[PDB]
Amino acid sequence: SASSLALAIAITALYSAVCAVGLLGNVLVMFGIVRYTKMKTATNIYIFNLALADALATSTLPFQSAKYLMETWPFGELLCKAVLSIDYYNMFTSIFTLTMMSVDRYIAVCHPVKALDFRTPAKAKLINICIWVLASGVGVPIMVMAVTRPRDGAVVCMLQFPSPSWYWDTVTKICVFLFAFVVPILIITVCYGLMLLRLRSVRLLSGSKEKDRSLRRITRMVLVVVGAFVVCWAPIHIFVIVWTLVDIDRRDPLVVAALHLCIALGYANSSLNPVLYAFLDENFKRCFRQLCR
Amino acid sequence: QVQLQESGGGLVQPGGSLRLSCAASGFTFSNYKMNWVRQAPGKGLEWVSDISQSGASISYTGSVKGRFTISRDNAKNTLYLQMNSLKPEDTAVYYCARCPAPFTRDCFDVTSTTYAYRGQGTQVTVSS
Amino acid sequence: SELDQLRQEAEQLKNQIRDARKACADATLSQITNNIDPVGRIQMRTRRTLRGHLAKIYAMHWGTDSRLLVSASQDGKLIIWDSYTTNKVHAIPLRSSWVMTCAYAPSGNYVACGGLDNICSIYNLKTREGNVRVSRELAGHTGYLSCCRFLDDNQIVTSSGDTTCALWDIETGQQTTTFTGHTGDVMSLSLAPDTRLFVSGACDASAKLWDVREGMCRQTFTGHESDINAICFFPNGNAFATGSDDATCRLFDLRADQELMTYSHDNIICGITSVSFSKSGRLLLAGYDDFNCNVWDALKADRAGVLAGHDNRVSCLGVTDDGMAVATGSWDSFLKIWN
Amino acid sequence: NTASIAQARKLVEQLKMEANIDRIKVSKAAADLMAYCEAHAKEDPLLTPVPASENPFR
Amino acid sequence: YXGFX
Amino acid sequence: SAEDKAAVERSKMIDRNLREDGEKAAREVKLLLLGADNSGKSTIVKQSGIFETKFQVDKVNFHMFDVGGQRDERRKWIQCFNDVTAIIFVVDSSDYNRLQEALNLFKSIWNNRWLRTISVILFLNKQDLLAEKVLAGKSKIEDYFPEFARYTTPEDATPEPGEDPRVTRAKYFIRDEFLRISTASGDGRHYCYPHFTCAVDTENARRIFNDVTDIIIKMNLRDCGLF
């Protein structure tokens, strides 16, 4: 169809734009961290691990965009196991690193004497190792259960759940909704919210309107971090709830365009994390001004 | 050899005027913030005035504000203190004190007892 | 009267000394060494990064074996390192953490430290039990301990912020000699290779050459503008360099009794914390407050190289006796080895 | 005072002990430092870089 | 996420 | 390679002990106590060479170092205190003749390049002596600070109950004399926390804890890059 081909190349360009921004932005963050910043704080380790998870997450976007154009999986079962596991595994490692930086800034502000112990760079690597190990409890069963099946004359890269397959698929979708959206958004909002409530008393800068300006900058930075997580991950998570619980058409061009837009939104969080965490990093701005002057 | 030589002090009437000069040698005069300090009889060393390296940032102690004018000529390497409307409590040995480090805003130890970048001072006596 | 008379006599004597120095100043060291070739571009690289200090490092001294080195940092620890393998040989907890100096004995059996406690602590490295203990505490300075250097296992010259130096007997714990004459805080001392003389640079913009045995100040060297934080003999013992807060290093000669060379550049506005010569003395390595070290051609006053490998204030610098390497310890809690 | 006069007398005595030293010419001292520098330049590892076999920090 | 159902 | 492995094991044991002692040290809050002889700096928290006072507030341990046994020249030894959490600057606010000396010392601390990242807890001590000096009227601040004649009490001033307004204007004038220097340079890296105190005050350790808490919050914000 003429409308279907225009919709296909629009979604592919949407996947390509998010992947190009996500790959270039995260590698540039990792290049600046390794060469210039040298990973000497706990926060610098967190941003590097966040950018590593985000770059690996956006690496599956060429595979998914080629799957939508060809309406099949042309990469074989071994790549169907690697790419789909990397999709789930790097979703968790990135979001848990997003969650942990909310905790890390909460510890930095609300428990400051306890932050001189807990926020050492040595404990940051241990926590980041624990993040990438705890997400292997999802990534590895996902890697086992990923199969290629013939479907409508084409090959689909899907998950072969144990019997009953309808039950274990819904349980996995609930566990992804709970432990990668709901539990992270509860921790991030509480940690940043308690941090902001403490920061309303912290004498950031001398003078009334110098202090309120810096406090507003942190509050706006919190709101764009929390707001980007909501508008990128809730649309894909509610859509999976709508796909599971509501008998939608599942073949409407409007529905599949609304689906892939929600998928590209979930990867746009990985694209925006260089902006919200490294472009807005005041240490990195100091390093950027030091490089320029 | 860092040398500060003060002159222009002497016996002056109350309400009179005096101009202190200090010839500076052995250092780049324009690189250092300069000080005028007092040693009153029976008291300690008291800071009086400071002029910045360029000559823009000037401050005085409050007992001499409106009465004393610090200035510097970096070409002649000379520090001046114009002491107008002199009071008997201004009777002191006045010392020119160089700040210890160049290109600094802080100025440490210029009122210390055995500070080295300070001249031998000149006696200003304000009595009738 | 009497005071004024003594002061004008002192000014007459300073004029006589200055005129004698001008009389012996027939040429400058720049003119005599104008025809020799430059040393090139000296590019030292970090070979070992000594990690383990957890506060800013204030001092270091190489041992005479040119392998072991002692470092003093304000985490309350003296660390003695095997520079070849980055192995820590000793960690000595200090009673006072505010340490500003350390020294390694030529025999290797003892180390020293000191600082705001006004006490030179001598630690024995060769105890029968095998643990480093306080062998002696040298109280008697009424100011902070800024530099110390062993002459042997029984005598040590210390410099202090009470404007004095002192030659101490370690066995009796007593100042055998007190070196007075400085009017500012004595920041550094350097022993001569024969250990018969020592120069000390102070906060009076002056360095003094003292006789260790006769006990008086033989010579006074001026020319610096600000506090001399650093001093080191030339390896022949007939000259020495000074690093100061006026952003200049100055090479003085003992037998000429005046400054031979100024090592400065207009883009350098920060003070020098540490100076040390190379084994031939051709390279004068100086640690600065702009977080870098400069290798100067000591005969031509040209910056031969830049040891830009420290994220904070370079507080100490030392060259091995065999000349193989330079250790720079800084306020970023790291020591780095260079050759 | 008295302590200031004693300090000035000690300074005068030290300046007298410093004015009566034998000072050589600066050209002679410069030539001596140059002769020491080029007399020991081959055994300066920081001036003439040694091979990595002879360097313990290789 | 979401691309594989 | 048997004594080499023994040396490596000894160095790793030394590394373990150094890491443990450095974690203990990282839990200890280092403070630099500075002030003149008349300031009453020894009686602030009420708990040779350099002297150390150890106190604890809310399980946080503070080591406050009063540097005695040194000469009056401090431009070198004070560089030892680059890495302290705060400098506690105690000022005899009643001694009008030495308030300018205290202001010059505060200015030299605030603008020193090795002290421009360290926040200052300002204790304007002897507020009772300042109050009894102001109420007597014999000694005038205008004889030592003419701008006090043009000074008004700020709207943000919080006076004590039963405090005379001239006493309030005097104490807040001395506070603003120090805060003009504090706000003149180094905005963002370090802050000045003024506190009015007597010698009978027992809440100075709590004030130090609150200020140090603010300082550590801001340093952790800079470590996070939020500020």
User: B73-95 burial string, b = 16+ CB within 10 Å, else e?
Assistant: ebeebbbbbebeebeeebbbbbb
The 8 Å CB, 24+ separation contacts for F174-177 are F174/F91, F174/F93, F174/F99, F174/F124, F174/F130, F175/F122, F175/F124, F176/F151, F177/F99, F177/F103, F177/F145
Report the structure determination method. cryo-EM
Q: Rounded to an integer, what distance in angstroms lies between the CA atom of residue C22 and that of residue C33?
A: 19
Chain D contacts of C31, Cβ < 8 Å?
Answer: 27, 30
Question: Is residue A222 classed as helix, strand or coil in its secondary structure?
Answer: helix
Choose, out of A103, A110, A116, A279, the residue to mutate when testing the contact with F (most F CBs < 10 Å): A116
Asked if C261 and C254 touch (Cβ cutoff 8 Å), the reply is: no
Facing residue for C203 by CB, picked from F11, F18, F76: F76
Contact (Cβ atoms closer than 8 angstroms) between residue B48 and residue B68:
yes
A89 in E contact zone (CB under 8 Å): no
**CB contact at 8 A, B68 and B19:** no
Among residues D26, D24, D21, the alpha carbon closest in space to that of C216 is found at: D21
Question: What's the residue count for chain D?
Answer: 58
Give chain F's domain count.
Answer: 1
Lay out the sheet containing B58-60: strands in order across. B11-12, B122-126, B92-98, B34-39, B45-51, B58-60
Sheet containing strand C197-202, strands side by side: C186-191, C197-202, C206-211, C217-222
Sort out which chain C residues have CB atoms less than 8 A from B114's CB and list them. Answer: 163, 183-184
- Cβ-based contacts of C87 with chain F (< 8 Å): 7-8, 10-11
Tokens 């490295």 belong to C125
In this structure, the strands spanning C133-139 and C165-169 are: unpaired
For residue B47, list chain F residues with Cβ-Cβ distance below 8 A: 100-101, 104
Rg (CA), chain F: 21
Contact A104, A42 (CB under 8 A): yes
Give the largest CA-CA distance in chain C. Answer: 67
CB C339 within 8 A of CB C46: no
**Cα–Cα distance measured from residue C156 to residue D51, given in angstroms and rounded to the nearest whole number:** 37
Give the chains touching C; criterion: ≥3 Cβ pairs < 8 Å.
B, D, F
Q: Which two tokens stand for residue F130?
A: 């300042």
Q: Which two tokens mark F129?
A: 């002596």
B18: left (phi over 0), alpha (psi -120 to 50) or beta: beta
Q: What domains are there in chain B, each with its CATH number?
A: 3-101 (2.60.40.10)
CA F78 to chain centre: 13
DSSP A72: S
Closest among F197, F188, F203, F50 to F122, alpha carbons compared: F197
What's the first-to-final CA gap in chain D, in angstroms?
A: 64
DSSP letter assigned to residue A34: I
Burial annotation B1-26 (CB, 10 A radius, 16+ → b, else e)? bbbbbbebbeebeeeeebebbbbbeb
Q: Are C151 and C165 in contact (CB under 8 A)?
A: no
Residues in chain B within 8 Å Cβ distance of C223: 1, 26
Residues β-bridged to residue C253: C239, C258
Domain annotation covers residue F9: no
Q: Is residue F166 part of a domain?
A: yes
Residue B25: strand, helix, or coil: strand
Spatial distance between the Cα atoms of B25 and C225, rounded to a whole number of angstroms: 10
Q: Which range marks the domain in which residue F94 is found?
A: 30-224
Q: Which residues in chain C are closer than 8 Å to F4, comparing Cβ atoms?
A: 85
A279 DSSP assignment? I
Q: Could you tell me which of A119, A118, A115, A134 has the C-alpha nearest to residue A183?
A: A134
User: How many Å from the N-terminal Cα to the C-terminal Cα in chain E?
Assistant: 8
Which chain E residue is nearest to residue A235, measuring alpha carbons? E2
C85–F15: do the CB atoms touch at under 8 Å?
A: no
SS3 F8: helix
Which chain F residues are within 8 Å of C227, Cβ to Cβ? 75-76
Alpha-carbon span B52 to C161, nearest angstrom? 28
The CA-atom distances, in angstroms, between F10 and each of C79, C92, C335 are 13, 14, 20
| Chain A closest-CA separation from residue E5 CA (Å) | 7
Neighbours of chain D (3+ CB pairs under 8 A): C
Exposure pattern of A42-79 as b/e (b: 16+ CB <10 Å)?
bbbbbbbbbbbbbbbbbbbbebbbebbeeebbebeeee
Token pair 């005072």 in the structure block, residue: D1
Q: Which tokens sit at B115? A: 């500070």
Chain D residues in contact with C26 by the CB 8 A cut-off are: 25-27
Strand boundaries in C215-282, DSSP class E: 217-222, 228-233, 239-244, 249-253, 258-263, 272-277
Q: Cα angle at A149 between A147 and A154, to 5 degrees?
A: 130
The answer to whether C96 touches C116, Cβ cutoff 8 Å, is: yes
Q: Which residues contact C58 (CB under 8 A, 6 or more apart)?
A: C72, C73, C74, C99, C100, C101, C115, C315, C316, C329, F80
Backbone angles phi, psi at C287, to 5 degrees: -95, 140
Between CA F144 and CA F84 the distance in angstroms is 33
| Helices and strands: H and E segment counts in chain F | 5, 6
Phi, psi for residue F152 in degrees, rounded to 5 = -120, 150
**Sheet of C334-338: strands edge to edge?**
C46-51, C334-338, C326-330, C314-319
Task: Give the distance, in angstroms, between the CA of residue C136 and the centroid of all CA atoms in the same chain.
Answer: 23
**CB nearest C9 (choices: D12, D23, D46):** D12
> Is chain D adjacent to chain C, meaning 3+ CB pairs within 8 angstroms?
yes
Q: Which domains does chain C have, with CATH numbers?
A: 2-339 (2.130.10.10)
Structure tokens at C60: 């270091």
Contact between residue C217 and residue C258 where contact means Cβ atoms under 8 Å apart: no
Q: How far is A43 from chain F (nearest CA, A)?
A: 6
Instruction: Give residue for tokens 């691990």.
Output: A49
Helix A76-110 to helix A253-274 angle, to the nearest 10 degrees? Answer: 50
Closest CA to C294 of C274, C321, C319: C274
Contact check, Cβ <8 Å, A42/F223: yes
Q: What strands lie across the sheet with B78-83, from one edge to the other?
A: B3-7, B18-25, B78-83, B68-73
A41 CA: distance to closest CA in chain F (Å): 7
| Residue B118 DSSP class | B
Q: Do chains F and E touch (3 or more CB pairs under 8 A)?
A: no
Any idea what the CATH number is for the domain that residue F113 is in?
3.40.50.300
* 3-class secondary-structure state, position C189: strand
Residues F115, B64, F193, F32: what is their CA dihedral angle, to the nearest 10 degrees? Answer: 40
Determine phi and psi for A150, rounding to 5 degrees: -70, 130
What phi, psi does B80 have (nearest 5°)?
-115, 140
- Dist CA A236 CA D50 (whole Å): 64
Q: Quote the CA–CA distance of C285 and A121 in Å, as a whole number.
A: 33
Select the residue of C2, C31, C282 nearest D44 (Cβ to Cβ): C282
Q: Is A167 exposed, middle or buried (0-12, 13-18, 19+ CB in 10 A)?
A: exposed
Q: How many angstroms separate the CA of residue F22 from the nearest CA in chain B?
A: 32
Please give the CATH number for the structural domain made up of A2-271.
1.20.1070.10
Q: CA of A106: how far to CAs of A198, A284, B94, C235, in Å?
A: 9, 20, 56, 57
**Assign residue A207 a region: left if phi > 0, alpha if psi is -120 to 50, beta otherwise?**
left
Residues C203 and C185: beta-carbon distance below 8 Å:
yes
Which chain C residues are Cβ-neighbours of B120 within 8 angstroms?
7
Enter the DSSP assignment of F160.
Answer: P
Show which residues on chain C lie within 8 Å of chain B, measured between beta carbons. 7, 14, 18, 163, 183-184, 203-206, 222-227, 245-247, 269, 271
User: Measuring CA to CA, how many Å separate C268 from each of A160, A282, C168, C271?
Assistant: 69, 28, 38, 8
Residue ranges and CATH numbers for the domains of chain D are 5-57 (4.10.260.10)
CA neighbor of F64 nearest in space, from F54, F56, F74: F54
For residue C78, which of C110, C48, C107 has the smallest C-alpha distance? Answer: C110
Running DSSP on this structure, what letter comes out for residue C38? Answer: P
Q: In a 10 Å sphere around its CB, with 0-12 CB exposed, 13-18 middle and 19+ buried, how is residue A287 labelled?
A: middle
Q: Which of A215, A10, A9, A226 is nearest to A101 (CA)?
A: A226
Distance of alpha carbon F227 from alpha carbon F215, whole angstroms: 12
Domain ranges of chain A: 2-271
Cβ-in-10-Å burial (0-12, 13-18, 19+) of C298 comes to: buried
Alpha helices in chain F (DSSP H): 2-27, 99-110, 127-136, 165-184, 204-224
Q: What is the C-alpha to C-alpha distance for residues A119 and A101, in angstroms, rounded to an integer?
A: 11
D3 touches chain C (CB under 8 A): no
Closest C-alpha among F163, F224, F214, F217 to residue F193: F214
First to last CA, chain C: 60
Q: Could you tell me which residues are beta bridge partners of residue C59?
A: C72
Q: Do chains C and B touch (3 or more CB pairs under 8 A)?
A: yes
Buried b (16+ CB within 10 A) or exposed e, D3-36: eeeeebeebbebbeebbeeebeebbbbbebbbeb
Burial of C107 (0-12, 13-18, 19+ CB in 10 A): middle
D6 reaches C (C-beta below 8 A): no
Nearest Cα residue in chain C from D49: C339
D19 touches chain C (CB under 8 A): yes
What number of other Cβ atoms are within 10 A of residue A293's Cβ?
A: 5
